[PDB]
Ligand binder design. Structure first.
Ligand SMILES: *CCC(=O)N1CC(NC(=O)Cn2cc(C(=O)N3CCc4c(cccc4OC)C3)c3cc(Br)ccc32)C1
Ligand SMILES: Nc1nc2c(ncn2[C@@H]2O[C@H](COP(=O)(O)OP(=O)(O)O)[C@@H](O)[C@H]2O)c(=O)[nH]1
Ligand SMILES: [Mg+2]
Length: 166
């Protein structure tokens, strides 16, 4: 029926792959490969509409440097992923959003802010900070854990709804 091109971005080690592998394969992996950059596919039904998801898991490992802008330009929605124990990954978020906007040539682009690794005890970024950042952009914030699967389906499903709103 419908095809949705999703892109998962965020700093190294936040859990972009872990989140993607959980959605499509329903398991958490003991050793991930940080170099792999590939598109993955998930079929879902949202609002009585079959949806095929073409999920691009970015890792900074493009064949050619020109593919960065092709990823953005061809992507319909973007998952802005940071880790709740990594302050630097949270601060990177505003850099990712501006570049997406810039190369897309648009102010309204479907995005969801995702705070991953909620299961961890040591946290440096609070929900309020992330919610205030998400509100300032006018997008939802969903807290996730790829380890427990908490909020993982809600993250991607909410992004598909945001794309339908565009
Ligand atoms: C563990 C490996 C992994 O998953 N990694 C390494 C990280 N590399 C990237 O995310 C590369 N990348 C950067 C952008 C991007 O548009 N910006 C990066 C941060 C930044 C920007 C502007 C000004 C200053 C900045 O940093 C201070 C914008 C990317 C976009 C896309 Br669609 C893919 C990769 C990518 C992830
Ligand atoms: N505790 C916990 N660890 C995670 C979670 N997601 C990813 N990780 C770990 O963080 C590391 C990086 O995950 P990965 O998906 O490779 O990050 P990526 O580089 O953004 O794709 C791995 O060692 C994972 O085990 C999570 O939700 N909870
Ligand atoms: Mg990865």
């Amino acid at each position: 029926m419908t095809e949705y091109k999703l892109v998962v971005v965020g700093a190294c080690g936040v859990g972009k792959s872990a989140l993607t592998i959980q959605l499509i394969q329903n398991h958490f992996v003991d050793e991930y490969d940080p170099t792999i950059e590939d598109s993955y596919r998930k079929q879902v039904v949202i609002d009585g509409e079959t949806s095929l998801l073409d999920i691009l898991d970015t890792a900074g490992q493009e064949e050619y440097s020109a593919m960065r802008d092709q990823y953005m330009r061809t992507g319909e929605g973007f998952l802005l992923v940071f880790a709740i124990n990594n302050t630097k990954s949270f601060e990177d978020i505003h850099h990712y959003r501006e570049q997406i906007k810039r190369v897309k040539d648009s102010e309204d682009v479907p995005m969801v802010l995702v705070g991953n690794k909620s299961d961890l005890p040591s946290r440096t970024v609070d929900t309020k900070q992330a919610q205030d950042l998400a509100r300032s952009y006018g997008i939802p914030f969903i807290e996730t854990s790829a380890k427990t699967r908490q909020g993982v389906d809600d993250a991607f499903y909410t992004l598909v709804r945001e794309i339908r709103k565009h």
